[PDB]
Ligand SMILES: Cc1nc(Nc2ncc(C(=O)Nc3c(C)cccc3Cl)s2)cc(N2CCN(CCO)CC2)n1
């Protein structure tokens with residue numbers, strides 16, 4: 001039943017892992033991650049030892065959250081769990097949690113290299129992002145922090161969504177709006193897509209307020225219909241005092257780009273989050289003609305997020321985490 005574990009010192013703690021995982025090699029330091037080779041599967045994997053997983057109520061809930069989330073994600077364009085383990089033989093000894101994923105070799109900073117991608121290559125990368133987003137959103141989950149560094153790719157350009165840092169952020173998050181919808185991630189995708197087509201950051205704001213300034217120069221100041229939906233007295237009054245800027249014509253901003261790409265960008269980067277295109281709708285858009293397949297753009301099982309409202313003791317989060325470790329089933333090889 002239980003695999004045989006071995007001990008090895010790695011970034012100044014004692015890691016303890018099943019024999020199947022060979023040649024651990026630190027690559028990052030919440031938790032440290034080593035690259036490794038999984039002899040059972042012939043896969044190169046990332047093994048993450050969680051740091052201080054049950055040191056406080058907050059740590060324990062965070063551990064449980066991360067485990068719950070990774071266990072739920074089962075989709076080609078989203079990072080999944082290959083394995084989860086502990087050296088512990090019972091709940092009473094349970095102090096350590098290790099998570100295992102595919103070892104991703106690069107992210108979308110490394111692929112762009114600040115040089116333009118071809119339009120065919122942007123189609124394939126954005127398609128995959130949207131395919132992953134459809135899945136995530138169908139589980140009633142919002143990513144909230146999509147950016148090139150959270151987008152990992154292999155050598156065949158197969159992409160997985162993972163989880164300056166303000167450049168890809170929807171204006172309503174910059175404003176602390178608090179009732180975010182799923183199209184915040186769509187905003188992020190438009191920013192990424194722009195950058196891939198042009199080789200340049202769309203909105204490289206220097207500071208917080210500068211980020212909003214650059215955003216408004218592209219998409220115009222709020223229209224009459226948007227203004228009706230703003231409950232904040234301070235926001236309305238400040239917005240009403242700005243010199244009204246015209247939304248720019250994206251066709252005369254993204255010069256020589258596929259006009260289908262431009263049309264899609266217009267539908268993603270609408271100031272009004274209620275009027276942004278959804279991921280499912282973006283997949284049906286003619287820009288993705290050569291990739292779109294309704295038979296193979298799957299949705300997720302319902303994801304039970306009720307734990308998030310709960311205030312439980314360290315030992316209760318720990319036992320729930322231990323239940324999740326014990327129930328884990330490896331994906332089909
Ligand atoms: C930090 C790092 N990650 C790499 N790949 C990763 N794949 C999966 C990872 C991972 O974190 N998964 C994961 C997640 C996402 C959540 C929970 C649990 C887990 Cl386990 S991290 C590669 C890499 N390289 C450094 C630079 N190069 C040397 C240059 O000569 C080689 C490549 N560096």
Ligand SMILES: CCCCCCCCO[C@@H]1O[C@H](CO)[C@@H](O)[C@H](O)[C@H]1O
Pocket residue numbers: 171172177178179180181212222226229239271272273274
């Ligand atoms: C000065 C910069 C103006 C930014 C305008 C923010 C537009 C965001 O769009 C708004 O998103 C809210 C948050 O989810 C929704 O509740 C509103 O219905 C929607 O119109």
